[PDB]
Design a protein around this nucleic acid. Structure first.
Ligand SMILES: [Zn+2]
Ligand SMILES: [Zn+2]
Ligand SMILES: [Zn+2]
Length: 84
DNA sequence: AGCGTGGGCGT
DNA sequence: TACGCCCACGC
């Protein structure tokens, strides 16, 4: 890629200066997005969003076959296969 | 099952 | 870069 990981112990390459900025967070341990409910910190805004659904019980993704609801699209994806 | 969490990638 | 999602892992 056009960007690399400067930490000597690590050797990953990143597409751009924010996938690199994002990745660097693993090393800096920065968790800039906090859950106002349990006060837990997260490295990503998208992961905080879905985390919050564990408190509220919001489940936006329903299975096409049986209708069971899930908080994340990947959980639904993992579930749908059971109908085979 | 419940979900943390990194990477690819589109806007 | 920030954001959001899809994906794929991992426990
Ligand atoms: Zn690294
Ligand atoms: Zn929380
Ligand atoms: Zn189903």
């Amino acid at each position: 890629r056009p960007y690399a990981c400067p930490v000597e112990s690590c050797d990953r390459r990143f597409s751009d200066s924010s996938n690199l900025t994002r990745h660097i967070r693993i090393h800096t341990g920065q968790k800039p997005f906090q859950c106002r409910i349990c006060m837990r910190n997260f490295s990503r805004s998208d992961h905080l969003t879905t985390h919050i659904r564990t408190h509220t019980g919001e489940k936006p993704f329903a299975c096409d076959i049986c209708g069971r609801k899930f908080a994340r699209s990947d959980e639904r994806k993992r579930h749908t296969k059971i109908h085979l």
